[PDB]
Amino acid sequence: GLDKYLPGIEKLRRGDGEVEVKSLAGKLVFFYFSASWCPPCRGFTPQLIEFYDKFHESKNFEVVFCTWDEEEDGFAGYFAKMPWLAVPFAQSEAVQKLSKHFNVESIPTLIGVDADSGDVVTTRARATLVKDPEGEQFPWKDA
């Protein structure tokens, strides 16, 4: 499923180490496009962390940080503040291609896909999450 979005990437960062992309089986996967330099990201990130801590297990999803930072030691200090996963900085090319695939023109953006089928579930989770903190309408399915 996730082969389409992250061609040939087999591992993702988690805290200080990594995890196999295989460990995402069965989950809804949210790609989070953000950067340390982005002003509206600052306010949205804590809202996403709150939702994630409350619901990642019970609503069975994962978040994968897809960085738009272009400085290496930017990224790392920035991802250290997040509880979820990240595309490794060295694989920024995959992130750029993913961003184009989903027509992400601005950040923050949050796109949810089904790990197993690859189907896109929601492209507007950044807007809907802020209006639905208790996830009553999760996963905010696209028309």
Q: Are 107 and 33 in contact (CB under 8 A)?
A: yes
Q: What SS3 state is found at 14?
A: strand
Nearest to 32 by CA among 18, 11, 15, 47: 47
State the first-to-last Cα distance of the chain, in angstroms, to the nearest integer: 21
**Exposure of 116 by Cβ count < 10 A (0-12 exposed, 13-18 middle, 19+ buried)?**
middle
Q: Which domains does the chain have, with CATH numbers?
A: 1-143 (3.40.30.10)
What SS3 class is residue 39?
helix
Of 98, 99, 122, 104, which is closest to residue 112 (Cα–Cα)?
122
What are the tokens at 13? 């960062």
Any idea of the CA torsion for 51, 57, 60, 61, to the nearest 10 degrees?
50
Residue type, 48: L
Tokens at 67, concatenated:
């960085």
| Cα–Cα distance, 89 to 114 (Å, whole number) | 24
H/E stretch holding 93: helix 92-101
How far is Cα 12 from Cα 70, in angstroms, rounded to an integer? 18
Going by C-alpha positions, the residue among 143, 125, 6, 120 that lies closest to residue 55 is 125
CB atoms within 10 A of CB 82: 19
Method used experimentally: X-ray
Contact criterion met (CB below 8 Å) for 21 and 10: yes
* CB-CB contact of 90 with 83 (8 Å): no
Indicate the resolution in Å. 1.7
Quick one: tokens of 95?
A: 């992130």
Amino acid identity for residue 66 in this structure = C
The tokens of 89 are what?
A: 């900085």
